[PDB]
Design a binder for this molecule. Structure first.
Ligand SMILES: *[C@@H]1O[C@H](CO)[C@@H](O)[C@H](O)[C@H]1NC(C)=O
Ligand SMILES: *[C@@H]1O[C@H](CO)[C@@H](O)[C@H](O)[C@H]1NC(C)=O
Lengths: 50, 48
């Protein structure tokens, strides 16, 4: 799964089976990292109009 | 893939199914790759 974003701590109580999370666009918004099984929230990097 | 979804619920109804809502969490995602068309459940006898 490829993508760009900032990985931050989260307070979403994922169930054991649950691995990732999806937004309305179906783009991944949270992910469970392998090896350490922790849940990292994925927030898209800041952008806007110059 | 043979998916087993399971849920355990504490109930106190005597005869029929209880009326309520309980979502089944996925328990086992099983890699078999075989044809299944017929099944049979296993019970346990009591001997005296
Ligand atoms: C390796 O990953 C598995 C699950 O993917 C995990 O249970 C295990 O703790 C990991 N080991 C190390 C050394 O990170
Ligand atoms: C499974 O077996 C039945 C007959 O036992 C057959 O009709 C069916 O096509 C088979 N399916 C597969 C995917 O092999």
């Amino acid at each position: 799964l490829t993508g760009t974003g900032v990985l931050t701590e989260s307070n979403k109580k994922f169930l054991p089976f649950q691995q990732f999370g999806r937004d309305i666009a179906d783009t991944t918004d949270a992910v469970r990292d392998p090896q350490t099984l922790e849940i990292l929230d994925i927030t898209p990097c800041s952008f806007g109009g110059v | 893939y043979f998916k087993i979804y399971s849920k355990h619920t504490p109930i106190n109804l005597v005869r029929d199914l209880p009326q309520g809502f309980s979502a089944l969490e996925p328990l086992v995602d099983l890699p078999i790759g075989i044809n299944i068309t017929r099944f049979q459940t296993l019970l346990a006898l009591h001997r005296s």
